[PDB]
Design a protein around this motif. Sequence first.
Motif, PDB file in Angstrom:
ATOM      1  N   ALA A 272      27.692  48.023  39.980  1.00  0.00           N
ATOM      2  CA  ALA A 272      27.671  48.080  38.521  1.00  0.00           C
ATOM      3  C   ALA A 272      28.607  47.059  37.880  1.00  0.00           C
ATOM      4  O   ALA A 272      29.520  47.420  37.135  1.00  0.00           O
ATOM      5  CB  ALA A 272      28.041  49.486  38.054  1.00  0.00           C
ATOM      6  N   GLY A 273      28.375  45.782  38.163  1.00  0.00           N
ATOM      7  CA  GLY A 273      29.218  44.749  37.592  1.00  0.00           C
ATOM      8  C   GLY A 273      30.261  44.197  38.549  1.00  0.00           C
ATOM      9  O   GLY A 273      30.529  42.999  38.530  1.00  0.00           O
ATOM     10  N   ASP A 274      30.861  45.058  39.368  1.00  0.00           N
ATOM     11  CA  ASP A 274      31.871  44.628  40.339  1.00  0.00           C
ATOM     12  C   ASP A 274      31.301  43.513  41.206  1.00  0.00           C
ATOM     13  O   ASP A 274      30.320  43.722  41.918  1.00  0.00           O
ATOM     14  CB  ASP A 274      32.279  45.795  41.238  1.00  0.00           C
ATOM     15  CG  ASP A 274      33.403  46.627  40.653  1.00  0.00           C
ATOM     16  OD1 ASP A 274      33.306  47.021  39.472  1.00  0.00           O
ATOM     17  OD2 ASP A 274      34.383  46.890  41.386  1.00  0.00           O
ATOM     18  N   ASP A 275      31.923  42.338  41.158  1.00  0.00           N
ATOM     19  CA  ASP A 275      31.453  41.198  41.936  1.00  0.00           C
ATOM     20  C   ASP A 275      32.470  40.760  42.990  1.00  0.00           C
ATOM     21  O   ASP A 275      33.546  40.269  42.661  1.00  0.00           O
ATOM     22  CB  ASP A 275      31.121  40.027  40.995  1.00  0.00           C
ATOM     23  CG  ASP A 275      30.715  38.768  41.742  1.00  0.00           C
ATOM     24  OD1 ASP A 275      30.456  38.853  42.961  1.00  0.00           O
ATOM     25  OD2 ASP A 275      30.647  37.695  41.103  1.00  0.00           O
ATOM     26  N   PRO A 276      32.136  40.946  44.279  1.00  0.00           N
ATOM     27  CA  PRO A 276      33.006  40.576  45.401  1.00  0.00           C
ATOM     28  C   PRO A 276      33.488  39.130  45.346  1.00  0.00           C
ATOM     29  O   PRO A 276      34.597  38.820  45.789  1.00  0.00           O
ATOM     30  CB  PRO A 276      32.121  40.827  46.620  1.00  0.00           C
ATOM     31  CG  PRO A 276      31.242  41.952  46.173  1.00  0.00           C
ATOM     32  CD  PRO A 276      30.880  41.548  44.767  1.00  0.00           C
ATOM     33  N   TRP A 277      32.652  38.247  44.813  1.00  0.00           N
ATOM     34  CA  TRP A 277      32.986  36.828  44.729  1.00  0.00           C
ATOM     35  C   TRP A 277      33.309  36.366  43.308  1.00  0.00           C
ATOM     36  O   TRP A 277      33.134  35.195  42.980  1.00  0.00           O
ATOM     37  CB  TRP A 277      31.826  36.003  45.298  1.00  0.00           C
ATOM     38  CG  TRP A 277      31.642  36.132  46.793  1.00  0.00           C
ATOM     39  CD1 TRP A 277      32.271  37.009  47.632  1.00  0.00           C
ATOM     40  CD2 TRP A 277      30.790  35.327  47.619  1.00  0.00           C
ATOM     41  NE1 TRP A 277      31.871  36.793  48.929  1.00  0.00           N
ATOM     42  CE2 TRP A 277      30.964  35.768  48.948  1.00  0.00           C
ATOM     43  CE3 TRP A 277      29.903  34.276  47.363  1.00  0.00           C
ATOM     44  CZ2 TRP A 277      30.277  35.189  50.028  1.00  0.00           C
ATOM     45  CZ3 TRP A 277      29.218  33.697  48.435  1.00  0.00           C
ATOM     46  CH2 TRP A 277      29.413  34.157  49.754  1.00  0.00           C
ATOM     47  N   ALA A 278      33.790  37.284  42.476  1.00  0.00           N
ATOM     48  CA  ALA A 278      34.128  36.962  41.092  1.00  0.00           C
ATOM     49  C   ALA A 278      35.071  35.765  40.965  1.00  0.00           C
ATOM     50  O   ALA A 278      34.949  34.971  40.033  1.00  0.00           O
ATOM     51  CB  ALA A 278      34.751  38.189  40.414  1.00  0.00           C
ATOM     52  N   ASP A 279      36.007  35.633  41.900  1.00  0.00           N
ATOM     53  CA  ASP A 279      36.970  34.535  41.851  1.00  0.00           C
ATOM     54  C   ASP A 279      36.572  33.260  42.585  1.00  0.00           C
ATOM     55  O   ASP A 279      37.366  32.318  42.659  1.00  0.00           O
ATOM     56  CB  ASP A 279      38.326  35.000  42.383  1.00  0.00           C
ATOM     57  CG  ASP A 279      38.877  36.187  41.622  1.00  0.00           C
ATOM     58  OD1 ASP A 279      38.609  36.294  40.407  1.00  0.00           O
ATOM     59  OD2 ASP A 279      39.589  37.007  42.246  1.00  0.00           O
ATOM     60  N   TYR A 280      35.352  33.212  43.115  1.00  0.00           N
ATOM     61  CA  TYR A 280      34.902  32.036  43.858  1.00  0.00           C
ATOM     62  C   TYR A 280      34.943  30.735  43.063  1.00  0.00           C
ATOM     63  O   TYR A 280      35.664  29.805  43.412  1.00  0.00           O
ATOM     64  CB  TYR A 280      33.472  32.232  44.377  1.00  0.00           C
ATOM     65  CG  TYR A 280      33.031  31.125  45.317  1.00  0.00           C
ATOM     66  CD1 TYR A 280      33.131  31.278  46.697  1.00  0.00           C
ATOM     67  CD2 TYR A 280      32.564  29.906  44.826  1.00  0.00           C
ATOM     68  CE1 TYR A 280      32.784  30.245  47.568  1.00  0.00           C
ATOM     69  CE2 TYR A 280      32.217  28.863  45.690  1.00  0.00           C
ATOM     70  CZ  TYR A 280      32.331  29.044  47.056  1.00  0.00           C
ATOM     71  OH  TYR A 280      32.015  28.012  47.914  1.00  0.00           O
ATOM     72  N   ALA A 281      34.151  30.677  41.999  1.00  0.00           N
ATOM     73  CA  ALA A 281      34.058  29.483  41.168  1.00  0.00           C
ATOM     74  C   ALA A 281      35.382  28.970  40.613  1.00  0.00           C
ATOM     75  O   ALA A 281      35.544  27.768  40.422  1.00  0.00           O
ATOM     76  CB  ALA A 281      33.074  29.734  40.019  1.00  0.00           C
ATOM     77  N   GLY A 282      36.321  29.877  40.361  1.00  0.00           N
ATOM     78  CA  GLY A 282      37.607  29.484  39.814  1.00  0.00           C
ATOM     79  C   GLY A 282      38.663  29.112  40.838  1.00  0.00           C
ATOM     80  O   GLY A 282      39.765  28.687  40.481  1.00  0.00           O
ATOM     81  N   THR A 283      38.330  29.264  42.114  1.00  0.00           N
ATOM     82  CA  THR A 283      39.268  28.939  43.184  1.00  0.00           C
ATOM     83  C   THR A 283      39.446  27.435  43.348  1.00  0.00           C
ATOM     84  O   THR A 283      38.477  26.690  43.487  1.00  0.00           O
ATOM     85  CB  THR A 283      38.804  29.532  44.523  1.00  0.00           C
ATOM     86  OG1 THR A 283      38.777  30.962  44.422  1.00  0.00           O
ATOM     87  CG2 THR A 283      39.750  29.119  45.649  1.00  0.00           C
ATOM     88  N   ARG A 284      40.699  27.000  43.321  1.00  0.00           N
ATOM     89  CA  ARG A 284      41.045  25.593  43.464  1.00  0.00           C
ATOM     90  C   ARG A 284      42.059  25.472  44.598  1.00  0.00           C
ATOM     91  O   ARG A 284      43.210  25.886  44.457  1.00  0.00           O
ATOM     92  CB  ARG A 284      41.650  25.068  42.157  1.00  0.00           C
ATOM     93  CG  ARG A 284      40.677  25.020  40.985  1.00  0.00           C
ATOM     94  CD  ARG A 284      39.637  23.922  41.174  1.00  0.00           C
ATOM     95  NE  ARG A 284      38.652  23.903  40.094  1.00  0.00           N
ATOM     96  CZ  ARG A 284      37.731  24.843  39.904  1.00  0.00           C
ATOM     97  NH1 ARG A 284      37.662  25.882  40.726  1.00  0.00           N
ATOM     98  NH2 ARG A 284      36.881  24.743  38.889  1.00  0.00           N
ATOM     99  N   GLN A 285      41.633  24.917  45.724  1.00  0.00           N
ATOM    100  CA  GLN A 285      42.530  24.770  46.869  1.00  0.00           C
ATOM    101  C   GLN A 285      42.134  23.563  47.704  1.00  0.00           C
ATOM    102  O   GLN A 285      40.989  23.114  47.657  1.00  0.00           O
ATOM    103  CB  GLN A 285      42.509  26.051  47.718  1.00  0.00           C
ATOM    104  CG  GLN A 285      41.107  26.512  48.123  1.00  0.00           C
ATOM    105  CD  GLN A 285      41.071  27.931  48.692  1.00  0.00           C
ATOM    106  OE1 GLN A 285      42.026  28.694  48.558  1.00  0.00           O
ATOM    107  NE2 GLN A 285      39.947  28.290  49.314  1.00  0.00           N
ATOM    108  N   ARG A 286      43.086  23.032  48.464  1.00  0.00           N
ATOM    109  CA  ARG A 286      42.829  21.859  49.296  1.00  0.00           C
ATOM    110  C   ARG A 286      43.583  21.969  50.612  1.00  0.00           C
ATOM    111  O   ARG A 286      44.508  22.774  50.732  1.00  0.00           O
ATOM    112  CB  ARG A 286      43.274  20.595  48.556  1.00  0.00           C
ATOM    113  CG  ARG A 286      44.774  20.553  48.271  1.00  0.00           C
ATOM    114  CD  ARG A 286      45.190  19.334  47.452  1.00  0.00           C
ATOM    115  NE  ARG A 286      44.869  19.472  46.033  1.00  0.00           N
ATOM    116  CZ  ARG A 286      45.345  18.678  45.077  1.00  0.00           C
ATOM    117  NH1 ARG A 286      46.164  17.681  45.385  1.00  0.00           N
ATOM    118  NH2 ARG A 286      45.008  18.885  43.811  1.00  0.00           N
ATOM    119  N   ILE A 287      43.182  21.173  51.599  1.00  0.00           N
ATOM    120  CA  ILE A 287      43.836  21.171  52.908  1.00  0.00           C
ATOM    121  C   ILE A 287      45.196  20.510  52.719  1.00  0.00           C
ATOM    122  O   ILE A 287      45.283  19.376  52.244  1.00  0.00           O
ATOM    123  CB  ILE A 287      43.006  20.373  53.941  1.00  0.00           C
ATOM    124  CG1 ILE A 287      41.631  21.032  54.109  1.00  0.00           C
ATOM    125  CG2 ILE A 287      43.740  20.313  55.275  1.00  0.00           C
ATOM    126  CD1 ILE A 287      40.626  20.185  54.855  1.00  0.00           C
TER     127      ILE A 287
END
Length: 295
Positions: A272-287
């Motif tokens: 019901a709205g809860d999205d496991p990958w809600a933070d995917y698009a906003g994730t900013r990380q690098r090696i």
Amino acid sequence: RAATAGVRISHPQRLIDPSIQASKLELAEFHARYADLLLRDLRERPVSLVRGPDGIGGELFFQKHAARLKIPGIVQLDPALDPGHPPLLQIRSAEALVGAVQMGSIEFHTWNASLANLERPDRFVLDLDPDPALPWKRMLEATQLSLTLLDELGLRAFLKTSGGKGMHLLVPLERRHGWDEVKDFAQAISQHLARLMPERFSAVSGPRNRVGKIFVDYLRNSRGASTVAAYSVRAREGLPVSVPVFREELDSLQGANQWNLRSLPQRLDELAGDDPWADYAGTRQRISAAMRRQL
Ligand SMILES: Nc1ncnc2c1ncn2[C@@H]1O[C@H](COP(=O)(O)OP(=O)(O)OP(=O)(O)O)[C@@H](O)[C@H]1O
Ligand SMILES: [Mn+2]
Ligand SMILES: [Mn+2]
């Protein structure tokens, strides 16, 4: 054709999976209804198709290139991206997606790079492949241990069931690295886990190299390789689906194929709205140099 994104479906009644009496039309309607969910992954990425002209009871065709597509809306990419082969493929709409199903497609697998820059991956994937006789609890424990390592490295990870027998870990990355660098980084993680716990993990491909163990597959990070898309169907009995899940519900899972095309609606309703990958698009990380030191 209101339920199939305007696409005409030939032989609508032929069976994709006789075990559950799932027809080609049902499969097309599923992709039309959940086109937006699948597009969260396919919209900007090249895609490989797994086509089964005779259903899961027949053979499968893994297609990467096509000279003369007949899917209204399908995008043909520039041959220069892969010289010596017909154009790669990209699906950016429900019409194109359903059109692919109309032409036999059952599974959709995407590249770890997006059209913004196909020479700089925007993610890497770790696919946990277990022994065909290893207890499910082993996969859960292996997934938890893999997430722990990723947390120590400072990388956010997004998991999903494969729809088959294992778990997939997607780790987004800023487009600052080339293909080789990302693949080598993924291999470094696999090898690291294999050195820490050789009784659980293996960094070498081949079922003979993971007897009673789990192989942290990093090979799908090669240019041109792909991984099944979140919410896409698998050409296997019961038509299971690859489903994103919260780390918190990991230990509550019973199998990599617990959800299927017909139970997905219930899954979405329970969330019901809860999205496991809600933070995917906003994730900013690098090696980082620190990451390499830890490995
Ligand atoms: N016939 C093929 N030839 C070459 N490559 C393929 C072929 N079929 C699939 N692949 C690729 O190899 C990968 C393996 O798919 P596969 O279903 O076996 O692993 P999976 O998605 O993790 O499911 P499982 O949990 O059962 O291992 C896919 O991501 C796909 O891109
Ligand atoms: Mn696998
Ligand atoms: Mn694999």
